């Protein structure tokens, strides 16, 4: 039955998401913080989309890598056509939702990926950072505080909800994030920040000696 | 059920790779060493991709030969478009993962191949050689020490793990690789080296009288 076929497709996608590493994106005083459990040094699950827009994903690496490349294609073209300040995270989340729905309907195998698009305010401007979570079927959700993706998200979500603190400093937020993700060490951990204090490009990677000193 | 078909294709690919010769790629003081059991003198399972990037494979010959040609075409085009030093092993590994995943998902017969991409540091520069293993389904793994492909992998992998030594000399690494592959004669073996001491092109084949002399 077509309904049974769709149910099997959804369950296959859910199983694909389940056997994946967990990523947490949380809002802190300076912007947005992405913390991922990534043993690999060359494979990246955290990336920049545009000047104030960052991207995180959980699932099959090649699929969200292709989605990342498509999103960068879209963002750069949109910024060139009109202006850099006309590109927003809402548009990127929307285009991701449409393309994911089209893939789910028409492609042979559903994309076993879960995406999060984060947007921060511009320089010299105050605005609450915005987080969108996008699922394999094309669903889109706005998360006011935090996003948890991949694997068994219930324990880490509960730990974050218990221990979250608004406007937390970078070190405190990083410690809370790593403690919630434990339910890890300096290595095999990927930390990135959308820093609203940066003039033009907010994305910045915190790896190596700096991450060891902070954590 | 689609899950039944996917597991059947996975079993097909695993069994096809299993009934194939074994290849080993291990890091040594001068760079990377490729040792393969190949009786044929015309069919080559070890090849160069780019100035500092080499390629090894195990499985159906024409399949990874086509993959080899595609990788060479990609590397040459990328190097011409930007620079010779802008080509890295990570990009080739990502392209191979993308292509293999797409073929596995869409093409009628999945590819029964296992690929290894090795990169060495540029001349007058120190950096640990990078080894990437790519499976039939598109999964990409970073091996810091050694890669074993084709046939029964457990005994050779265990023997290498017991006999592995960092910064081993060329001859000592060759003897270790031959001993691990045995678990052979001068002929019916293909030996190649990514030598970090070479000025521009690191790939170099070691066959015949010299190959006997090192043995």
């Amino acid at each position: 039955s077509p309904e049974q076929a769709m149910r099997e497709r959804s369950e296959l996608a859910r199983k694909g998401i389940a056997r994946a590493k967990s990523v947490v994106a949380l809002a802190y005083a300076g912007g947005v913080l992405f913390v991922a459990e990534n043993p690999s040094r060359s494979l990246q699950k955290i990336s920049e989309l545009y000047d104030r827009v960052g991207f995180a994903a959980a699932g099959k690496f090649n699929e969200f890598d292709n989605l990342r490349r498509g999103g960068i294609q879209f963002a750069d073209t949109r910024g060139y056509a009109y202006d850099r300040r006309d590109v927003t995270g809402r548009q990127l989340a929307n285009v991701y939702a449409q393309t994911l729905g089209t893939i789910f309907t028409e492609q042979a195998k559903p994309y076993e990926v879960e995406l999060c698009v984060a947007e921060v305010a511009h320089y010299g401007e105050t605005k609450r950072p915005e987080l969108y979570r996008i699922t394999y079927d094309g669903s889109i959700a706005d998360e006011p505080h935090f996003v948890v993706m991949g694997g068994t998200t219930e324990p880490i979500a509960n730990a974050l909800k218990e221990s979250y603190a608004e406007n937390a400093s970078l070190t405190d937020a990083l410690r809370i994030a790593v403690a919630a993700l434990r339910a890890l060490g300096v290595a095999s951990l990927e930390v990135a920040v959308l820093d609203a204090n940066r003039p033009r490009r907010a994305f910045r990677r915190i790896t190596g000696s700096a991450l060891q000193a902070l954590l | 059920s689609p899950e039944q078909a996917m597991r059947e294709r996975s079993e097909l690919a695993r069994k096809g790779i299993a009934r194939a010769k074994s290849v080993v790629a291990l890091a040594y003081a001068g760079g990377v060493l490729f040792v393969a059991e190949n009786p044929s003198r015309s069919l080559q399972k070890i090849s160069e991709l780019y100035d500092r990037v080499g390629f090894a494979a195990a499985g159906k010959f024409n399949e990874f030969d086509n993959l080899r040609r595609g990788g060479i075409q990609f590397a040459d085009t990328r190097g011409y478009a930007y620079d010779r030093r802008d080509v890295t092993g990570r990009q080739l590994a990502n392209v191979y993962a993308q292509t293999l995943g797409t073929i596995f998902t869409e093409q009628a017969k999945p590819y029964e191949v296992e690929l290894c991409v090795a990169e060495v540091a540029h001349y007058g520069e120190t950096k640990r050689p990078e080894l990437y293993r790519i499976t039939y389904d598109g999964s990409i793994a970073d091996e810091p020490h050694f890669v074993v492909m084709g046939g029964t992998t457990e005994p050779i992998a265990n023997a290498l793990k017991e006999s592995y030594a960092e910064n081993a000399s060329l001859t000592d690494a060759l003897r270790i690789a031959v001993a691990a592959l045995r678990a052979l004669g001068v002929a019916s073996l293909e030996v190649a080296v990514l030598d970090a001491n070479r000025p521009r092109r690191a790939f170099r084949r070691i066959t015949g009288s010299a190959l006997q002399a090192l043995l």
Binding site: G16, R19, A20, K21, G59, K60, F61, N62, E112 | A97, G101, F104, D137, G138, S139, I140, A141
Partner: peptide, 4 residues
Amino acid sequence: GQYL
């Protein structure tokens, strides 16, 4: 594939 690499579902991780």
